[PDB]
């Protein structure tokens, strides 16, 4: 017919959704978490230092064994770091140095690399010849790739600069599922522990959840007022925190379908670049644009820890699967281990 | 002490030496970022010096290895990935003067130049301005006056006068005159004077950085 009907239909649908969310919201999270004892101050000391990189480190990812990790820098070299011996295990020379993300498969055989280039190339670490080579070349996208993650040994999720996400099959290199529900540049992804759902944060101040098999949008959250940079899933598979450049980090829930609690401060005016939970999810680590990193309590919303070991903007903050330690990497070519 | 970890430490040391060698090799070269409104004015510049996302063009001139990075095929929000180009040596900003009569594009080019020259990440990167299609602009001068898009312009319809006025208008948009240097040069389909001017501007940026690093100047 005409757009005037669809506009008012969408408007009344949004109004009904907001009214339902307001009616279902009976109490706040603070009133129910006040009965929980706070964690207090948690001091963390730097255990290991990694100065092998010569350029700005962008992203990193932990493995299943929580011992080896992959690191990507602006110089275009994928470095495999051993967290216990601080030795360089493997060095992968990249064809394009303009990379900003990397991935480590749960099996520990393949790794992904992407960035300003439209290809998140796959590199095999367990080659019989001992050298690293390109395993899969995903040249279907047209915008810069923001994040790539492994769902299994044959499927890989990827977020591009355009408002689309892709599920590539490593066996054939074709898009298995294409997500076009987003309206902004997808900036970060976060997979659920059950490997069935994954939530992505984009520049349109919204986070969208998608199924790895169905591909339909389940819930949409519009609590932020600025572009979301990083996102991480809760270890229980029911919630996730989203960080944006407005110095606020909002914790959304799948069952509640509403922002549970926001983390911000008056002196903290810089944006967030990395966010990740611990093993139990009680502590939330967040890297900001300043020279320091924060560790908040997921319940009391208090500054449980402050790490001032770096002198540049924090770029990546990875947490082990067992929560033994965390790895903080910034643009100062330094990757430190905290616990 | 260890049994097999000593060979692992030796391998790590060799990998670190190789990484340092690659870093020194990359520092020996020079990198530049190509920007500007319009694809033809940038395609002709890429074609004038040569031996999808981002295009990387390597070429050696006067023992200097120039690496031009073109991000014109991105079509995304620039303020989300421009920080990756903080360590570039120079920003070759190419614009076509013929846009002064085509629909309005001159205002967009000036706004883009003002946004680039005022970025917080480009506080230590110089910009080399290139004005392509000089013959087309000279032909259009005798057809339509310059005051079609510049209401404040009031003078004779002269090619050199209009060129100087456009250069002054582009230079006045830079609010960091005490820090940045604008190397405006008219370029077209001609001989290697373009790459010579690029080399001269690169040497100027290098000597300015070296003087600002060792002290005041």
């Amino acid at each position, epitope marked *: 017919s005409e757009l005037d009907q669809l506009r008012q239909e969408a408007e009344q649908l949004k109004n009904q959704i907001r009214d339902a969310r307001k009616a279902c919201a009976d109490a706040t999270l603070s009133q129910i978490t006040n009965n929980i004892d706070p964690v207090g101050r948690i001091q963390m000391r730097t255990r290991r230092t990694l100065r092998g990189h010569l350029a700005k480190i962008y992203a990193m990812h932990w493995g299943t064994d929580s*011992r*080896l990790l992959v690191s990507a820098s602006q110089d275009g070299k994928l470095i495999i770091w*051993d967290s216990y*011996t601080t*030795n360089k*295990v*493997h060095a992968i020379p990249l064809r394009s140095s303009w990379v900003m993300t990397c991935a480590y498969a749960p099996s*520990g055989n393949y790794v992904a690399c992407g960035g300003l280039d439209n290809i998140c190339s796959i590199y095999n670490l367990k080659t*019989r*010849e*001992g*050298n690293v080579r390109v395993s899969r070349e995903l040249a279907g996208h047209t915008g810069y790739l923001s994040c790539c993650r492994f769902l299994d040994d044959n499927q890989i999720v990827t977020s591009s600069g355009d408002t689309t996400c892709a599920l590539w099959d490593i066996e054939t290199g074709q898009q298995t599922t294409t997500f076009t529900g987003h309206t902004g540049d997808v900036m970060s992804l976060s997979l659920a522990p059950d490997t069935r759902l994954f939530v992505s944060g984009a520049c349109d101040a919204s986070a969208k959840l998608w199924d790895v098999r169905e591909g339909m949008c389940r819930q949409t959250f519009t609590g932020h007022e600025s572009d979301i940079n990083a996102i991480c899933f809760f270890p229980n598979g029911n919630a996730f925190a989203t960080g944006s450049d407005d110095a606020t980090c909002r914790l959304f829930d799948l069952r509640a379908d509403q922002e549970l609690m926001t983390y911000s401060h008056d002196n903290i005016i810089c944006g967030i670049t990395s966010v990740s939970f611990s093993k139990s999810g009680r502590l939330l680590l967040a890297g900001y644009d300043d020279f320091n990193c924060n560790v908040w309590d997921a319940l009391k919303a208090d500054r449980a820890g402050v790490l001032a070991g770096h002198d540049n903007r924090v770029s990546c903050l990875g947490v082990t699967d067992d929560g033994m330690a965390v790895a903080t990497g910034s643009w100062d070519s330094f990757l430190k281990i905290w616990n | 002490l*260890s*049994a*097999e*970890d*000593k*060979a*692992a430490v*030796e*391998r790590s040391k*060799m990998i670190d030496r190789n990484l340092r060698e690659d870093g020194e090799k990359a520092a020996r070269e020079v990198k530049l970022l190509l920007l500007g409104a319009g694809e033809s004015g940038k395609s002709t510049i890429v074609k004038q010096m040569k031996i999808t996302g981002i295009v990387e063009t390597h070429f050696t001139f006067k023992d200097l290895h120039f690496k031009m990075f073109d991000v014109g095929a991105q079509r995304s929000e620039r303020k989300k990935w421009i920080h990756c180009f903080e360590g570039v040596t120079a920003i070759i900003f190419c614009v076509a003067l013929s846009d002064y009569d085509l629909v309005n594009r001159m205002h967009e080019s000036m706004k883009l130049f003002d946004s680039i020259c005022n970025n917080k990440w480009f506080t230590d990167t110089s910009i080399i301005l290139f004005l392509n299609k000089k013959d087309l602009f000279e032909e259009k001068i005798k057809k339509s006056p310059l005051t079609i898009c510049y209401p404040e312009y009031a003078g004779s319809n002269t090619y050199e006068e209009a060129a100087a006025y456009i250069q002054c208008q582009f230079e006045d948009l830079n609010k960091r005159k005490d820090t940045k240097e604008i190397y405006t040069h008219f370029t077209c389909s001609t001989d290697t004077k373009n790459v010579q001017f690029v080399f001269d501007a690169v040497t100027d940026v290098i000597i300015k950085n070296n003087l600002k690093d060792c002290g005041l100047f």
Partner: single-chain antibody, 233 residues
Framework: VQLVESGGGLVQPGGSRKLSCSASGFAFSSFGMHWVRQAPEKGLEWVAYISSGSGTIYYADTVKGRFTISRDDPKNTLFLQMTSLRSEDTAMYYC??????????????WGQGTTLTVSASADIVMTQATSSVPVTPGESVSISCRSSKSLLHSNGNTYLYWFLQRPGQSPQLLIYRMSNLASGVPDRFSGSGSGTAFTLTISRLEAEDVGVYYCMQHLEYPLTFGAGTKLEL
């Protein structure tokens, strides 16, 4: 992956000879090399080892100073120069590739080896409990061996390797580090141990299991192979 050795045959006592090994199918400069000699009546025995960066060149106590090892990465060649060799050096030599990192499988591939025939303490001893055990298809066999000291290092890794030499073929790695099996090896084998006493079981034995089983420790550079257990079909 292919290793071609040459320069064997008859040799005069006290002479000089340079074994030449050519590698293909993998990065030669990335993998270190080992030379293992096998006597016509005895088992395997380590001779020399050269690293990937041509450093930390070590030799055994019995061949210290007499032999020399060199490598050429731009030429992709390995030269083993043996000068003034004794009469007890007549044996079959094999070149083995290896790499050292977390999760690596060293001693994975073994070369063909060449036979050279001469014309007429402070090491870890591997005491093997048996020399020959008859086996039948479908049954199970338990191989055990002891060492002079506990191989359980401080990092928790047990430097134990099991190789299988088939009659008429080069040995192959079955289980490395006592907890991981090499590529292309069936998972029916099971190796375990507490640091001193080790146990290797072979479930669902087949006809391809005929050969000699050698145990090796890697706690120190002077590697010492076991006596070997020959299984009769």
């Amino acid at each position: 992956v292919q290793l071609v050795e040459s320069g064997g045959g008859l040799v005069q006592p006290g002479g000089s000879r340079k074994l030449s090994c050519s590698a293909s199918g993998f990065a030669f400069s990335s993998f270190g090399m080992h030379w293992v000699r096998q006597a016509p009546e005895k088992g395997l025995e380590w001779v020399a080892y050269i690293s990937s960066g041509s450093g930390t060149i070590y030799y055994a106590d019995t061949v210290k100073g007499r032999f020399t090892i060199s490598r050429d990465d731009p030429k992709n060649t390995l030269f083993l120069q043996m000068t003034s060799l004794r009469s007890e050096d007549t044996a079959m030599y094999y070149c083995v590739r290896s790499i050292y990192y977390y999760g690596s499988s060293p001693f994975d591939f073994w070369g063909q080896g060449t036979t050279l025939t001469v014309s007429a303490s402070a090491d870890i001893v591997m005491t093997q409990a048996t020399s020959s055990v008859p086996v039948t298809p479908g049954e199970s066999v338990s191989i055990s061996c002891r060492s002079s000291k506990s191989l359980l290092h401080s990092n928790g890794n047990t430097y134990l390797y099991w190789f299988l030499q088939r009659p008429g073929q080069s040995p192959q790695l079955l289980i490395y580090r006592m907890s991981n099996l090499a590529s292309g090896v069936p998972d029916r084998f099971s190796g375990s141990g507490s640091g001193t006493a080790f146990t290797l079981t072979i479930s669902r034995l087949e006809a391809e299991d005929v050969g000699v089983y050698y145990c090796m420790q890697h706690l120190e550079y002077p590697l010492t192979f076991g006596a070997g257990t020959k299984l009769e079909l």
